[PDB]
């Protein structure tokens, strides 16, 4: 659980804003296909028919080992719906453990705003845990169907690189590759295993404090969420974040539509001015007592790149507003090394070998700070 | 191919009124804002105004300020500028130039259309 | 209503010398400055942003510094191509105001 996994190095793809997909085989024969890595759910489904949104699904009825449950499926979303029928197959990861599990399988026959046009992925691979699993925990996740069939040790680490334009990641299924990042591997506590739930202690906006209560971060909780792109936050804490980066950013001529996610800003290529932005910082539960790490992020990470033409470099503002809590999106964890130690129930995060940077700034996992709220920044149960 | 296309320009009588157009082409149009700017023959520039088309959010100078009137249409990709009581100071040559919201600076400028008023 | 006052007004230099336009800010415009190139007839183009930050395409020989009020920008090799009429720029406030032109012609 601690070497060098040079085959599943540079393993994951995607595209800015599109999430981050790894190539998994799915029945007999094994039928390839590109599937989005998500955190933020249990479930394991594909596409199951032609649509013109995807280049190619999963075909039940070619697959020997394919069994029907002859149950259903459906699963509202924030946002991106999708339901279909449940199944079992065999299933394997090409570039990852040379290993092979029968899970369970999600054949999706309708969804909305859910596949996005061509993002060359036709597959969700729900990483968290099976609470939140549908239709209910009964069903096996993909990873507790892995760590219970094999020997893979339970946890698994990610790596977004980010830089529609093309990105690349890793994604070690069992281990830590200590080639994938530089310093230490700074854990927060996991609260609780449904979703990555966390505990954000502390918010900063170019050093400043937010000065907000500790458990309005983390209203009604705080996730670590590959599978969303934007870093969400609950209503208050979005209205106080984007009024203070405003107030430290000199951006008075930007449409308001910008702050809403829905207006785009572009540059000449190469000549986007991240100076001009503040650096946000998100201080994390720390495992021992009273101490807390913070993660440091630039523009360069929470605004995201976007018809788009060749010359022009064009971002939308990856910072969006929720009603269930703070969402630790794909934003979050691209200059970073996130490791999701499952056996010991936490969540380290590191400076990646691919870490975002400039000649002036850089993202940064420092610590220890003091934190005397600790634990009690929580708000349910 | 980042472009601008400037129209419109032509003899103007004293007092009177012209409409004047920026063709935009080959770049993202919403994304940037467009600046209007003048220059007279042998003299320097003068930052007349400026409009965001998503949406104006627009911007004059005392100069301008109640002759002039910004208007853009986004399905024609195409910034506009309205010019009345026009008098003889207004003669120079007219630019428009894709602005970046931040910076406020003009990275790329059209070949401009003059105006002259006279008699 | 800032003013910029450019210097000097007009200069004639050699091929690979070194020449240096400065600018001054009637107040304190921290780096909120630009510098442009314009060809006689031709469109001006820009050269320098917010000070010190080449824009995209911009040969290296072209350099900007400064801050506050006194900002300077300098061809460390002059080139045949590089005659033109330079100008310098403020829009801390959102109230641009440009300097009055500085035209480097060229000597053979």
């Known amino acids: 659980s601690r070497g060098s996994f040079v085959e599943m190095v540079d393993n994951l793809r995607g595209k800015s804003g599109q999430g981050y997909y790894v190539e998994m085989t799915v029945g007999s024969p094994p039928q390839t296909l590109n599937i989005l890595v998500d955190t933020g759910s249990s479930n394991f489904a594909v596409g199951a028919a032609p649509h013109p949104f995807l280049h190619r699904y999963y075909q039940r009825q070619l697959s020997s080992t394919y069994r029907d449950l002859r149950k259903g499926v459906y699963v509202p979303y924030t946002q991106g719906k999708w339901e279909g029928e449940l199944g079992t197959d065999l299933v394997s990861i090409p570039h990852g453990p040379n290993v092979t599990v029968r899970a369970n399988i999600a054949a999706i026959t309708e969804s909305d705003k859910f596949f996005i046009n061509g993002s060359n992925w036709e597959g969700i691979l729900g990483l968290a845990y099976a609470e939140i699993a549908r239709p209910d925990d009964s069903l096996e996740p993909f990873f507790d169907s892995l760590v219970k069939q094999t020997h893979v040790p339970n946890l698994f680490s990610l790596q977004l690189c980010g830089a529609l334009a093309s990105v690349g990641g890793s994604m070690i299924i069992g281990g830590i590759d200590h080639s994938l990042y530089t310093g230490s591997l700074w854990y927060t506590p996991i609260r609780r295993e449904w979703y990555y739930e966390v505990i954000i202690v502390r918010v900063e906006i170019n050093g400043q404090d937010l000065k907000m209560d500790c458990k309005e971060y983390n209203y009604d909780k705080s996730i670590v969420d590959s599978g969303t792109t934007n870093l969400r936050l609950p209503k208050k804490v979005f209205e106080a974040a984007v009024k203070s980066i405003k107030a430290a950013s000199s951006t008075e001529k930007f449409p308001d539509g910008f702050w809403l996610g829905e207006q785009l800003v572009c540059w000449q290529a190469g000549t986007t001015p991240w100076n001009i932005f503040p650096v946000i910082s998100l201080y994390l539960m720390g495992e021992v007592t009273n101490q807390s790490f913070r993660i440091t992020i630039l523009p360069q990470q929470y605004l995201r790149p976007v018809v788009a033409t060749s010359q022009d470099d064009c971002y939308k503002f990856a910072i969006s507003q929720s009603s269930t809590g703070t969402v630790m999106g794909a934003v979050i964890m691209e200059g970073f090394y996130v490791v999701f130690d499952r056996a010991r129930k936490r969540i380290g995060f590191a400076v990646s070998a691919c870490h975002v940077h400039d000649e002036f700034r850089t993202a940064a996992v420092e610590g220890p700070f003091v934190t005397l709220d600790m634990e009690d920044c929580g708000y349910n149960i | 191919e980042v472009q601008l296309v400037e129209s419109g320009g032509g003899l103007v009588q004293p007092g009177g009124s012209l409409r004047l157009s920026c063709a935009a082409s080959?770049?993202?149009?919403?994304?940037?804002?467009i600046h209007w700017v003048r220059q007279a023959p042998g003299k320097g520039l003068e930052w007349v105004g400026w409009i965001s088309p998503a949406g104006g959010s627009t911007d004059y100078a005392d100069s301008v300020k109640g002759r002039f009137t910004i208007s853009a249409d986004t399905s024609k990709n195409t910034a506009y500028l309205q010019m009345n009581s026009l008098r003889a100071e207004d003669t120079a040559v007219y630019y428009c130039?894709?602005?970046?919201?931040?910076?406020?600076?003009?990275?790329?400028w059209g070949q401009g259309t003059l105006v002259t008023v006279s008699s | 209503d800032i003013q910029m006052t450019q210097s000097p007004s007009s200069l004639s230099a050699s091929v690979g010398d070194r020449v240096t336009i400065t600018c001054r800010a009637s107040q304190d415009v921290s780096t909120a400055v630009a510098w442009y190139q314009q060809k006689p007839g031709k469109a001006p183009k820009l050269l320098i942003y917010?000070?010190?930050f080449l824009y995209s395409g911009v040969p290296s020989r072209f350099s900007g510094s400064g801050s506050g009020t006194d900002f300077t920008l300098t061809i460390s090799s002059l080139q045949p191509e590089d005659f033109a009429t330079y100008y310098c720029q403020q829009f801390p406030t959102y109230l641009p105001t440009f300097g009055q032109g500085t035209k480097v012609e060229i000597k053979r």
């Open positions: 130039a894709r602005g970046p919201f931040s910076p406020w600076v003009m990275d790329y």
């Open positions: 080959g770049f993202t149009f919403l994304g940037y804002g």
């Open positions: 917010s000070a010190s």
